[PDB]
Write a protein that binds this ligand. Structure first.
Ligand code: CL
Ligand code: CL
Ligand code: NI
Ligand code: NI
Ligand code: NI
Ligand code: NI
Lengths: 104, 104
């Protein structure tokens, strides 16, 4: 996490202050440089992590899409099962009628 | 997108250079301040957008989970449908036998 702009200013003031000792001036300069570098690292990290979460979210959805596709196939299978039984149950309805007429 | 650390250095050098005119020194100081502020804005933007993509990815998955749950319910329904037909088809098998014995 980078310094808030208020804080980065306090460091610039010190750095740009000819009243403070050149040892403090130099320490400030370092903090400036490190805090900047830090912010740039966070930039690179978060840009990579955003892209990463994107590819990951999309990948995980595609897992659920193929899971759903698996379910649809099972669903069409239960239709084939249901149809097979139905064609026979109907055939038996026809039959039981014929035997009821013939024998009554 | 923030300046690469190499570039941020070129600006610090100018800023900290007593040989260059105080007008350039001041312009550099501004660029420093703006580029820093810029990086901090990108920080805030990307932290918010990462959290946002997170809540969004999780929300979209929960949409597919409830879509799948809808499918499971339809699947259990096709079992109730299938069972109902099966109990009757079996009852007819018993019946057609009885009529085949009684009348042959
Ligand atoms: Cl068909
Ligand atoms: Cl049962
Ligand atoms: Ni620091
Ligand atoms: Ni800085
Ligand atoms: Ni600039
Ligand atoms: Ni800076």
């Amino acid at each position: 996490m980078p310094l808030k702009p208020e804080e980065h200013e306090d460091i610039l003031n010190k750095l740009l202050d000819p009243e403070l000792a050149q040892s403090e001036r130099t320490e400030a300069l370092q903090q400036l440089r490190v805090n900047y570098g830090s912010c740039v690292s966070e930039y690179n990290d978060l840009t990579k992590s955003l892209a990463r979460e994107r590819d990951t979210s999309r990948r995980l959805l595609a897992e659920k899409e193929r899971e759903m596709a698996e379910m649809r196939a099972r669903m069409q299978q239960q239709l084939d099962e249901y149809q097979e039984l139905l064609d026979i149950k109907l055939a038996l309805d026809m039959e039981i009628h014929a035997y009821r007429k013939l024998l009554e």
